[PDB]
Design a protein around this ligand. Structure first.
Ligand SMILES: [K+]
Ligand SMILES: [K+]
Lengths: 365, 365
C-alpha cells in the first residue's frame, strides 16, 4: 500500500541540481511540474526508508510519528499526479497548490524531529546512537533539499525564488551579528563588538558577492556568532572586559571563506566535535511561561544544521580551537555557481548497511 | 620459513605504551629485553604483512625490496633470542648489540621507502593509489614506533632516552624557525620574521613545558615553518615586503597547541589535503651535483610525516586555509603524559580488507 509506493520511489536516486541550474530555470511552470512530480516523491521516499530504520524507541515517539505522517501524506498527494497530463492546465495548477500545502505542512519539521530526539532521550544507548547521528545529518540535509525545491516552485509560480544572484556577503554577516548581539545583550547584559575585515582577492576593493541563498548564509553566521558570543561572555565574565569577535571575509578564485575568531577560552580537541553531535546537544526547549532571557546555546541544533547548510552546496564549516585561548570557525562556500551542486543522501544497500553494521585496523586507546 | 615467522608474530597485536610508561621505565636492561624480544618481532611482522600487499610494481622496486630485506634480516636476528634466558647476561648484552645494529641498519628507511614511491611513479594508477596512501601512513607510523623503541633501549642501555620530561616548547619552536629561515634565505634571498606569542592558561606567566620527544616537536615545527615561508615568499614576491609568520602557543588543561599563521595566499579547500597525499607530493630528490639552493618543498614527505608525529602520541596536526589570504597550521599535543599513548597500526582482517575492497550512500558530484 504505502510501503509499495515508498519502495517504488526509493529505488531511484535523487537528482542533484547545481545553483546555476536553479537560477537558469527561474530566470516555465510545466517544466517544473515535470521535474518535481518525480523528484519530490523520490526525495521523500528515499528518506522515509531511513526513518523506518530508526531505533524503535525513537521511531515510536509522538514527534517522529507526526513527522512521518506528514511525509506519508505529502508522498500520497504528490503521487496523485503521476498519470496526469503536462498539457492539462488544472493538473498544473493543483500541482502548484499541492506544493504550497506541503510546504506549509512541513514548516516545523526541524524542531518537531528535534523534539522527537528529546522524547527518546528523556524516556530511554551508545550503539544505536551512532545510528542517530548518521540519520539526522541525512534527514536534515534531505529536508534542506526538499525545502529548497518547494521554496523555488512556490516563489516562482505561487531574486530568483530564494536565490540572490548578487548576495551581499558583508551585509548578511552584519545582520547575523546584530541579531546575535541583541540576544547576547538580553542574556549576559553586555556583548562583544564586531571587527569585520574583507579581501576580494579575485578583484581588490570591489564588493564581495556570490550567487547564494541569503537565508542559508544568514543561518550559518547567526549561529556561529551566538556560539562565539556565549564562549566570550562566559570566559571573560570575571574581567568584565570582552574581546571583540573578529570576522575575516575572503573571496578567492574558488572559495568564499568567512573566518570568525573569538577569545572565548576554547575547547580541547577531544571535545570540540560534540558541538556537531545531535545527542550531546539535545536539550529541552525553554519554557514559554517565563520572561527570563533565552540562552545563546541549547535547543534546535543550530550548529550541526549550519554545517549541513554549508555542505549542501559543496561548501563546509569547520571549527578549530586552541584550549585556554579561543576558537576559529570557518565557513567555506563555492565562489562559482557551477561548482555549487546539491549534496543529497541516497537510500540503497550502502545506506542500509550503515544502520546494520558494527576489530579495527588501529590499536585501541 | 620466513613467511612462517612473519605469520606467527603478525597474529599478535602491537602493545602501545604511554609516554608515562616510557618515562617511568627509563627513570632495568632485563625488563626491557623481556618486553622487546616479543614486541619488536610483533611490530616488524605486523607491518611486513602489509608490505606484501603493495601493488606489484611498487613492491618490486629496488628501494622497497631493500627496505623489506632490512626488515626480514632484523626480524630473524631478533627471533634468535626467543628461547634465550633473561638471566643469562650474554643473551642480554647481545640483545642490546642487536638493538644497536638494527637501529643503524634502519636509519634511512624513510627516504629509501620514499625513493621506492618515486621509482614506482617514474616507471608506471588511481585505484591502487588509495592503497598506497593507506599503507604509507601505517608504514611510517609503524616506523616511528619502532624507532622510538630502538632509541629508548639504545640510549638507556648502550633526558630519559630521547624523552625530555621538561621540554621547553618555545625554545624548540625558535630552533625550528631559525633553521627554516636559513633555508628560506638561501632559496628566496629573503625571509619573513617570526612573531611568537604564548599563553600558559594552566598557570599564567610560567614557562610552557611538557613531557615530550623534542626531535618530534622540532620536525613538526621545522616542516610547518618551511611550508609557511614558501607560501609567503611566492605569494608576495612581486611586492618585496614579506608578512611575518605568527606563532601562538597555548597550554590548556588538556591540549598544548601551536598555531602557525601565514599570509602566503592560501589554497582552496578542494586542494589543501594534497599536502598530506604521498603520491601528489612525491618529487625526485634534488641532484647532489649543484650549488643551487634546495627548495623549501619537495622530496621526503615532511608534511604527512609531521602529522604522523603529532598523531603518534594522540595529538594531531591540522591545516585550514583561506584561499586568497593565508593559512593556519595547528599542532595539537596532549598536555598530560598519561594521555600520550602510542597510536599503532595492526595487521588483521580489517587491515587486509582495506587493500581488497572498493554505490555510495551520498549522491555523486
Ligand atoms: K535510492
Ligand atoms: K596482528
Amino acid at each position: 500500500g504505502v510501503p509499495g509506493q515508498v519502495d517504488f520511489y526509493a529505488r531511484f536516486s535523487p537528482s542533484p541540481l547545481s545553483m546555476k541550474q536553479f537560477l537558469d530555470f527561474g530566470s516555465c511552470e510545466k517544466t517544473s511540474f515535470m521535474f518535481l512530480r518525480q523528484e519530490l516523491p523520490v526525495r521523500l521516499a528515499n528518506i522515509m526508508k531511513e526513518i523506518s530504520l530508526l531505533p524503535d524507541n525513537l521511531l515510536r515517539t509522538p514527534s517522529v510519528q507526526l513527522v512521518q505522517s506528514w511525509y506519508i501524506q505529502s508522498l500520497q498527494e504528490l503521487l496523485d499526479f503521476k498519470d496526469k497530463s503536462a498539457e492539462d492546465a488544472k493538473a498544473i495548477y493543483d500541482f502548484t497548490d499541492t506544493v504550497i500545502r506541503i510546504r506549509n505542512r512541513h514548516n516545523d519539521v526541524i524542531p518537531t524531529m528535534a523534539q522527537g530526539v528529546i522524547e527518546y532521550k528523556e524516556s530511554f544507548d551508545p550503539v544505536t546512537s551512532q545510528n542517530v547521528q548518521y540519520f539526522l545529518d541525512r534527514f536534515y540535509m534531505s529536508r534542506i533539499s526538499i525545502r529548497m525545491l518547494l521554496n523555488q516552485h512556490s516563489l516562482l509560480f505561487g531574486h530568483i525564488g530564494s536565490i540572490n544572484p548578487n548576495c551581499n556577503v558583508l551585509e548578511v554577516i552584519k545582520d547575523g551579528y546584530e541579531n546575535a548581539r541583541r540576544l547576547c545583550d538580553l542574556y549576559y547584559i553586555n556583548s562583544p563588538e564586531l571587527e569585520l575585515e574583507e579581501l576580494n582577492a579575485k578583484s581588490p576593493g570591489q564588493p564581495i558577492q556570490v550567487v547564494y541563498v541569503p537565508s542559508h548564509l544568514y543561518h550559518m553566521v547567526f549561529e556561529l556568532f551566538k556560539n562565539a558570543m556565549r564562549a566570550t561572555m562566559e570566559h571573560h565574565a570575571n574581567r568584565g572586559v570582552y574581546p571583540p569577535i573578529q570576522v575575516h571575509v575572503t573571496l578567492g578564485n574558488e572559495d568564499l571563506t568567512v573566518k570568525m575568531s573569538d577569545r572565548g577560552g576554547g575547547v580541547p580537541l577531544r571535545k570540540i566535535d560534540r558541538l556537531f553531535n545531535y545527542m550531546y546537544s539535545t536539550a529541552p526547549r525553554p519554557r514559554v511561561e517565563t520572561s527570563r532571557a533565552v540562552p545563546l546555546a541549547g535547543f534546535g541544533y543550530g550548529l550541526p544544521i549550519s554545517r549541513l547548510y554549508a555542505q549542501y552546496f559543496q561548501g563546509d564549516l569547520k571549527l578549530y580551537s586552541l584550549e585556554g585561548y579561543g576558537t576559529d570557525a570557518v565557513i567555506y562556500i563555492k565562489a562559482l555557481s557551477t561548482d555549487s551542486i546539491e549534496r543529497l543522501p541516497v537510500y540503497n544497500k550502502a545506506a542500509w548497511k550503515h544502520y546494520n553494521t558494527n576489530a579495527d585496523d588501529w590499536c585501541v586507546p
